[PDB]
Amino acid sequence: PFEIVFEGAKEFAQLIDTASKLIDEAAFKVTEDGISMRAMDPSRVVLIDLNLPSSIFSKYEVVEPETIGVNLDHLKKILKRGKAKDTLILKKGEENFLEITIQGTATRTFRVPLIDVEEPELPFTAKVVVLGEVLKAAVKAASLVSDSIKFIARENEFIMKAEGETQEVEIKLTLEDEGLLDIEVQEETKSAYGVSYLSDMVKGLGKADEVTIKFGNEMPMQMEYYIRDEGRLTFLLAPR
C-alpha cells in the first residue's frame, strides 16, 4: 500500500503520454526510493525506462513495495482530466485497484483496475543535447524522403540526413550557432534509425524541452528527457 502525491496533474499526464506512445500496458514498480517502469514496444526495437524518485513528489509514503500493472489507455483517460495546477493523488490499499484522485477546484476520485502482463555493453562515442523542436522538425523533414534517418556527430557539429533514390534532406547544426545546447564526441560517430520510432519518441516532447542523445557507430541510440530535474524518461532505440 502507498499514498503518493504529485503537484501538477497536467504535467504528470503529459509525461505518461510521452512515455507511452509505443506501449499499451506497463508494470510500475513502487518502492521506498521511487517509481520505476521498464517496457519494450511490441516490435522489440525500443526499450522504455521511466524513473520517478520520491524527491519529485510532495508526499511519498510507501508502507510495502508493490508492482502494479495497468492498461495505459485507461490510465491516460483519467489523467487527461487533470488541470495545470491540480494535485494528483495515487493510492493503493489491499484491494486490487489503483485509486486516483484529482484535486483542484473540485475533488474527483477514480479507480483503475490492476492487471498482470509479463515483463549488451553500450560504449557510446557521441553525446548531443538539443531542444525537442530540433528533433521534431528533423524527423518530419526526413520522413518526406525516407523511412530512416542518419545521425552524424563530429567535433562541435551534429548532422541529420535522409535520402532516397533522388531526394535528400540534411540538417546541420553547431554549438557555435547555438543549434545545439551541447556536444561531446570522442570520434566521428554515425548511425541510422527508423523514422517511425523517433517520431513516436519525440511527438510528446515540448518544443522547448531539453533532450540528451547518446550513440555510437552502427549502435543503438539512448535518448533522455528529465522531469523536475530528478525524474527521467529514457528510450534505447535499435539501429537500422
From Swiss-Prot:
Keyword DNA-binding attributed: yes
Covalent S-S links between cysteines: none
GO biological process, one term: regulation of DNA replication
A Pfam cross-reference name: PCNA_N
Gene3D superfamilies: 3.70.10.10
Transmembrane helix recorded as keyword: no
Transmembrane segments: none
Keywords: DNA replication, DNA-binding
Gene Ontology molecular function: DNA binding; DNA polymerase processivity factor activity
Function per UniProt: Sliding clamp subunit that acts as a moving platform for DNA processing. Responsible for tethering the catalytic subunit of DNA polymerase to DNA during high-speed replication. Unlike its eukaryotic paralog, loads on circular DNA without the replication factor C (RFC) clamp loader, although RFC greatly increases loading efficiency. Stimulates the ATPase activity of replication factor C (RFC) in the presence of ssDNA. Stimulates the helicase activity of Hel308 and may alter its substrate specificity.
Subunit structure: Homotrimer which circularizes head-to-tail (head is a N-terminus, tail is at C-terminus) to form a toroid. RFC opens the toroid so it can load on DNA. Interacts with both Pol I (pol) and Pol II (polB-polC), with Hel308 (hjm) and with Hjc. Interaction with the C-terminal PIP-box of RfcL may stabilize the toroidal structure.
Family of the protein in this entry: Belongs to the PCNA family.
HAMAP family, alphabetized: DNApol_clamp_arch (MF_00317)
PANTHER family tied to this protein: PROLIFERATING CELL NUCLEAR ANTIGEN (PTHR11352:SF0)
Name recorded for this polypeptide: DNA polymerase sliding clamp
Originating organism: Pyrococcus furiosus (strain ATCC 43587 / DSM 3638 / JCM 8422 / Vc1)
